[PDB]
């Protein structure tokens, strides 16, 4: 080619500026444009254009937005990074009781794809409840709690534990209370009110997809033709052709082929003496 | 043999070999950014990127610039003569992490203080060596002295 003394001294024949670091973003600074200060995927957000100098001073870590996200993650105003599970307990034997309490919903705000239909047994919501309660009970321990619930109580299904949260607890109070830590229960109640919820949101999502709402996996609408139940090209619904239907035979303009024996309409030329 | 093969099913990724067919200086600042994240700037440069998801977008945005080629991993373990049993997460567990141009730190200064200290932990490696000779001779000069009086 035309390499000339050094990395970044390639082609040197086009008149672009080498040594210019094209990868780096433009310093848009004061200029007002939707393209300001935005990673290219955020260009569609024309409702919060990031123009202006202060956005240049703070995306870039300039004068006094030098630690800009003045409250980034890794601070909690509320619980200050200490787990809210009481260890100061009356009896040391029962200190392990409080382990596994829900600090928030844990199940609805995340939005996992619980593919469990609401009629499965309870023992099939254990793989979900665990992922938030490890460090509290071994996975194979839950399957001892999430079975004594199915055996002892009258509850069997994820739909039941969502419709009988009162009848379940009252069982636990008067029958459990020594083995099953109620941490499981309020966890068991938080999933069973989600698996039941999502199945309502799935069963509806499948029931519109027939009525013709047709949204993609990422749920954006996609418009697409329905399936055929009758003839594709309309016959009794056809719009008239739209061009004056002076047929090719009323004015034999072109595209017409006739046998030479069967030549028509020469009533004065060569049909007067027909053959 | 008219049957879905039956056996413990291993899955093998893909490895894209990417080259650069169009000049980078004609394109945008974002398209140049993707090429930079594929270790590609000059025309004719060539890199071997994995088929992991966030690479699939980077390559996608710049499809009109590169010429990709896909290799299943078994079709890579043979492109370089490799025994089938040796995986790649043990081959890499052998090369040092300080390969040519070790890191890509956030600016050519932080680069030049990542290479500096790397050229320091060499100095300290000989200096932690030269006193470890003295600290053992000193702990012996103590015992020779101590046991001298006995």
């Amino acid at each position: 080619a035309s390499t000339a003394k050094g990395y970044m001294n390639r082609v040197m024949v086009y008149a672009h500026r080498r040594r210019k670091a094209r990868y780096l973003a433009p310093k848009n600074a004061h200029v007002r444009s939707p393209l300001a200060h935005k990673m290219p995927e955020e260009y569609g957000n024309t409702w919060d254009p990031r123009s202006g100098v202060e956005w240049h001073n703070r995306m870039r870590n300039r004068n006094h937005y030098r630690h800009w996200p003045w409250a980034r993650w890794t601070d909690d105003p509320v619980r200050f990074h200490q787990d809210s599970v009481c260890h100061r307990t009356v009896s040391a034997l029962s200190t392990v009781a409080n382990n596994g309490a829900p600090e928030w919903d844990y199940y609805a705000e995340v939005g996992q794809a619980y593919e469990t239909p609401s009629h499965f047994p309870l023992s099939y919501t254990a793989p979900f409840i665990y992922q938030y309660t490890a460090q509290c009970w071994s996975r194979e321990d839950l399957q001892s709690y999430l079975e004594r619930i199915e055996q002892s109580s009258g509850l069997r299904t994820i739909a039941d534990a969502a419709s009988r949260r009162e009848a379940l607890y009252t069982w636990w109070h008067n029958a459990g209370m020594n083995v099953i830590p109620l941490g499981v229960l309020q966890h068991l109640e938080l999933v069973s009110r989600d698996i039941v919820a999502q199945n309502a949101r799935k069963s509806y999502r499948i029931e519109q997809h027939e009525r013709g709402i047709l949204r993609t996996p990422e749920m954006e609408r996609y418009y697409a033709l329905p399936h055929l139940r009758g003839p594709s090209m309309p016959v009794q619904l056809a719009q008239p052709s739209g061009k004056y239907p002076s047929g090719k035979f009323t004015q034999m303009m072109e595209d017409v082929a006739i046998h030479p024996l069967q030549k028509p309409d020469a009533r004065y030329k060569h049909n007067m003496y027909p053959a | 043999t008219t049957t879905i093969a039956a056996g413990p099913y291993r899955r093998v990724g893909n490895v894209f070999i990417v080259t650069c067919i169009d000049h980078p200086f004609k394109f945008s600042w974002e398209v140049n950014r993707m090429l930079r994240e594929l270790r590609l700037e000059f025309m004719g440069q060539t890199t071997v990127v994995p088929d992991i998801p966030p690479v699939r977008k980077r390559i996608w945005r710049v499809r009109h610039v590169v010429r990709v080629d896909q290799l299943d991993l078994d079709e890579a373990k043979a492109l370089i003569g490799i025994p089938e049993h040796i995986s790649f997460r043990d081959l890499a567990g052998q090369i040092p992490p300080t390969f040519g141009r070790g890191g890509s730190v956030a600016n050519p200064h932080m680069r030049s203080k990542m290479n500096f200290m790397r050229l320091r932990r060499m100095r300290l490696r000989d200096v932690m060596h030269r006193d470890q000779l003295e600290k053992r001779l000193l702990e012996e000069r103590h015992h020779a002295l101590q046991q001298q009086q006995q």
Binding site: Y7 | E41, Q45, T46, G100, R101, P108
Partner: peptide, 6 residues
């Protein structure tokens, strides 16, 4: 201009 050594 940060190099790549590719």
């Amino acid at each position: 201009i940060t190099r790549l050594y590719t």
